Amino acid sequence: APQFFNIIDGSPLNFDDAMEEGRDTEAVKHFLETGENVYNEDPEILPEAEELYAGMCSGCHGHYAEGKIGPGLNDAYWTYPGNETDVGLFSTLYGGATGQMGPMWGSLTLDEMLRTMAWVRHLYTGDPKDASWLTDEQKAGFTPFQP
Amino acid sequence: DKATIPSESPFAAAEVADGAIVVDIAKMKYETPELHVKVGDTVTWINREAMPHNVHFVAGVLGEAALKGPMMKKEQAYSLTFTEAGTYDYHCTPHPFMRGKVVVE
Amino acid sequence: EAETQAQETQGQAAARAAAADLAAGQDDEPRILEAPAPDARRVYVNDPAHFAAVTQQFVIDGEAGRVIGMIDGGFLPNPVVADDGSFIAHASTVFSRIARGERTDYVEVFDPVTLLPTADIELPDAPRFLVGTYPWMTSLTPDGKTLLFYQFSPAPAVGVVDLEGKAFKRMLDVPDCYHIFPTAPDTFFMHCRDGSLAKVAFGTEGTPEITHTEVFHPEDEFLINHPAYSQKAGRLVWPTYTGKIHQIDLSSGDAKFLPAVEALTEAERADGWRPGGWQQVAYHRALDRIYLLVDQRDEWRHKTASRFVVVLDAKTGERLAKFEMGHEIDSINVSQDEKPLLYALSTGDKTLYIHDAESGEELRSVNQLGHGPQVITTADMG
Amino acid sequence: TDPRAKWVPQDNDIQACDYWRHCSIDGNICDCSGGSLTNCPPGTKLATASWVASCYNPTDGQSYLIAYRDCCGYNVSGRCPCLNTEGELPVYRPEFANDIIWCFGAEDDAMTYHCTISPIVGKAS
Ligand code: HEC
Numbered sequence: 001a002p003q004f005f006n007i008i009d010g011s012p013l014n015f016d017d018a019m020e021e022g023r024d025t026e027a028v029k030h031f032l033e034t035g036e037n038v039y040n041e042d043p044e045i046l047p048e049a050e051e052l053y054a055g056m057c058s059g060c061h062g063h064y065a066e067g068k069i070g071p072g073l074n075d076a077y078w079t080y081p082g083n084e085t086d087v088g089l090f091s092t093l094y095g096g097a098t099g100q101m102g103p104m105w106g107s108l109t110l111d112e113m114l115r116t117m118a119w120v121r122h123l124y125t126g127d128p129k130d131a132s133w134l135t136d137e138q139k140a141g142f143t144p145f146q147p
Numbered sequence: 148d149k150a151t152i153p154s155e156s157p158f159a160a161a162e163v164a165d166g167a168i169v170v171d172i173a174k175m176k177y178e179t180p181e182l183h184v185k186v187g188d189t190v191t192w193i194n195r196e197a198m199p200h201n202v203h204f205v206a207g208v209l210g211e212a213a214l215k216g217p218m219m220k221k222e223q224a225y226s227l228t229f230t231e232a233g234t235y236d237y238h239c240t241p242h243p244f245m246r247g248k249v250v251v252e
Numbered sequence: 253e254a255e256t257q258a259q260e261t262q263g264q265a266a267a268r269a270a271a272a273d274l275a276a277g278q279d280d281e282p283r284i285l286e287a288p289a290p291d292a293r294r295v296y297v298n299d300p301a302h303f304a305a306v307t308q309q310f311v312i313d314g315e316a317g318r319v320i321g322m323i324d325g326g327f328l329p330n331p332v333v334a335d336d337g338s339f340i341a342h343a344s345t346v347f348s349r350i351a352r353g354e355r356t357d358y359v360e361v362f363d364p365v366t367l368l369p370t371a372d373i374e375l376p377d378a379p380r381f382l383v384g385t386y387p388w389m390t391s392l393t394p395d396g397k398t399l400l401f402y403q404f405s406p407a408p409a410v411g412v413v414d415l416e417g418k419a420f421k422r423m424l425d426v427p428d429c430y431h432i433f434p435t436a437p438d439t440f441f442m443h444c445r446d447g448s449l450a451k452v453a454f455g456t457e458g459t460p461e462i463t464h465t466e467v468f469h470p471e472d473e474f475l476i477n478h479p480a481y482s483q484k485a486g487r488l489v490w491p492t493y494t495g496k497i498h499q500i501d502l503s504s505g506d507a508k509f510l511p512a513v514e515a516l517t518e519a520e521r522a523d524g525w526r527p528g529g530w531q532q533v534a535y536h537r538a539l540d541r542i543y544l545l546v547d548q549r550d551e552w553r554h555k556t557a558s559r560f561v562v563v564l565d566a567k568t569g570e571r572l573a574k575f576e577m578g579h580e581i582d583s584i585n586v587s588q589d590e591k592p593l594l595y596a597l598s599t600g601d602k603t604l605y606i607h608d609a610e611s612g613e614e615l616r617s618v619n620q621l622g623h624g625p626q627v628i629t630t631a632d633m634g
Numbered sequence: 635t636d637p638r639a640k641w642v643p644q645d646n647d648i649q650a651c652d653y654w655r656h657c658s659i660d661g662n663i664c665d666c667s668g669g670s671l672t673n674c675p676p677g678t679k680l681a682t683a684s685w686v687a688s689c690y691n692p693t694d695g696q697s698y699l700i701a702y703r704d705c706c707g708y709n710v711s712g713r714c715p716c717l718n719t720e721g722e723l724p725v726y727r728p729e730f731a732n733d734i735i736w737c738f739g740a741e742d743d744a745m746t747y748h749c750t751i752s753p754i755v756g757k758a759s
């Protein structure tokens with residue numbers, strides 16, 4: 001089972017603060033058990049994932065996560081190294097980072113967080129071989145993002 | 148005139164004050180392209196890759212003369228304290244295609 | 253020091269005449285000669301001299317294989333020659349104390365016959381891009397009235413020099429693109445980092461019109477620094493590190509991408525053949541043929557000399573011939589007349605070998621051309 | 635030796651063109667005119683900007699990033715000339731292009747080429 005810690009102070013994340021809605025999906029259950037996000041490169045949820053990102057994240061991270069007043073999220077560099085893994089990315093969104101990048105549990109359901117995460121992974125512009133959050137099959141069909 | 152230089156030479160990133168305004172440089176880009184800060188703030192650039200980089204403001208931006216910042220090696224930092232409100236564009240000397248912007252308010 | 257068969261014949265003919273003149277009672281009355289009128293066979297060789305502070309350009313009659321004149325230049329100058337043979341010029345750089353002190357960037361224009369400068373135009377704020385000599389980093393507009401030069405730092409820009417009014421006009425801001433291919437008095441194309449071409453339309457005032465074409469090559473396909481461009485045909489011939497050739501037709505005023513062709517055969521590529529050198533490609537407008545310097549080499553030895561030249565039909569990509577040059581050749585070019593001459597310059601031998609562009613046979617050579625000759629320029633007077 | 639053959643690095647003589655750190659050097663080795671492997675000769679100006687290359691070190695089997703900074707404000711030295719292009723890309727990818735005179739940042743705006751140094755700036759790929 002994955003270890004879910006606040007990326008800043010290392011304290012255990014408290015899922016008791018999570019919204020009761022959207023904590024039951026197969027995606028969330030699978031994720032909390034394996035640390036694997038089944039929504040990655042899932043054609044069926046990407047359309048909604050894009051909308052979630054657009055309304056909640058684009059203002060600071062850019063239309064294509066290329067960065068704006070906030071840091072880019074579309075290449076292999078991460079201020080917080082753990083974000084190269086979905087367990088880490090999830091932890092960042094749930095527990096928050098610093099400054100205006102605070103916890104998202106008050107606005108997003110656990111399922112929505114996973115869907116938003118999937119869009120961030122889809123915006124990756126790096127080499128597919130470097131996308132360790134993708135399975136072999138997913139890597140085969142992945143193409144670095146381009147506007 | 149519109150900015151002061153805390154340190155003429157780059158320093159170890161470890162010396163960067165915690166919770167300081169930082170712009171990371173990696174994968175041939177300034178990770179935060181349009182940084183917004185307030186008058187008086189000190190911005191710190193930190194190179195995160197082997198490829199050397201620097202910040203360069205053409206003449207007439209921060210003063211009468213251009214400001215060719217020193218080249219930073221991996222894990223080195225360089226700071227600039229803006230004292231005047233305004234938008235300041237900059238680029239990387241050897242890599243003209245690398246551009247960034249600091250908006251002081 | 254060492255005479256080539258060509259200069260040996262010239263030296264003998266001159267001795268014969270001097271001896272006969274003396275015997276006939278003729279007196280010697282020294283004067284300053286004028287170079288013969290510019291023709292299709294005149295060829296120019298520039299010597300960057302391995303980055304020396306001062307350089308030289310040799311004016312050669314390709315038919316006789318004789319040096320008919322010279323021109324002094326500063327640090328890494330960019331030479332240009334009017335296709336109509338009305339003048340020659342270069343963008344140059346000098347310093348108050350040889351290689352240090354105050355720097356002066358300037359454009360000098362020369363009379364093609366007397367070789368005297370007819371204009372000296374200073375360029376404000378030393379804007380020249382100092383780099384190994386690339387013919388298309390400084391270009392003339394087809395009307396021959398404007399000279400355009402590239403600036404790399406602090407930002408990408410193209411300087412505009414009015415040769416007619418003998419004055420610097422202004423700097424044009426452009427995207428992250430390189431090289432300058434003029435197609436009209438007010439338009440030129442550049443090649444950009446993203447793989448597209450940029451069309452720049454400018455005027456005497458105001459910001460220029462910049463439009464991008466589609467991306468024509470991928471990130472991993474590398475286009476060499478020395479593409480061949482025929483302004484009169486509006487043809488841009490651009491080889492990649494592997495010999496694949498991209499041809500762009502700009503004769504309509506807009507970029508039209510022609511089908512790419514492989515300059516090397518399937519067997520040659522399999523045997524390790526790749527183009528290599530400085531000016532690796534040449535284009536003959538009238539015959540619509542492409543000449544490329546190639547040899548067997550490792551993938552990262554793309555700047556070494558080559559000993560072979562392959563010729564292909566630019567329209568179909570058909571292999572027409574492969575010449576064994578017999579020397580270490582760095583750069584090639586061709587005259588633009590009916591029966592073209594193939595110029596093969598050896599930086600190491602400091603010699604220009606002159607071949608028949610059809611048979612590949614070596615006709616004559618001119619040696620002692622500076623310290624490190626690299627660039628050949630010819631005019632398309634047709 | 636065939637100039638067209640694959641370049642083979644060595645780690646025993648810095649004044650030879652096949653010394654491993656010179657895998658993408660263009661010009662002259664500074665050590666031959668009063669400088670050293672990583673220092674400029676007296677009287678010249680040290681540039682800050684430069685093109686780089688990942689060079690393979692046969693001694694430890696690791697690849698290091700070399701920053702080819704030029705020593706400027708002097709006429710070319712004329713000693714120990716070398717031209718290697720391992721991983722060298724065209725001018726539109728300037729970060730790896732070596733025909734460019736990398737003198738930017740040198741004191742007194744010195745832009746003339748004298749020689750090139752081969753300092754390591756970090757580990758590569
Ligand atoms: C502006 C008010 C923001 C909004 C809305 C979102 N983010 Fe953000 N994010 C912001 C800042 C100023 C920072 C840097 C924080 C720090 O402590 O350094 C971040 C950072 C991230 C990260 C970490 C990136 C890294 O390099 O490790 C991630 C993964 C991230 N942000 C994601 C993210 C998503 C998915 C958002 C929409 C729900 C989102 N952010 C909104 C500022 C702002």
Ligand SMILES: [Cu+2]
Pocket residue numbers: 175199200201239240241242245
């Ligand atoms: Cu840079």
Ligand code: NA
Pocket residue numbers: 071072073074075076077078079178
């Ligand atoms: Na990033």
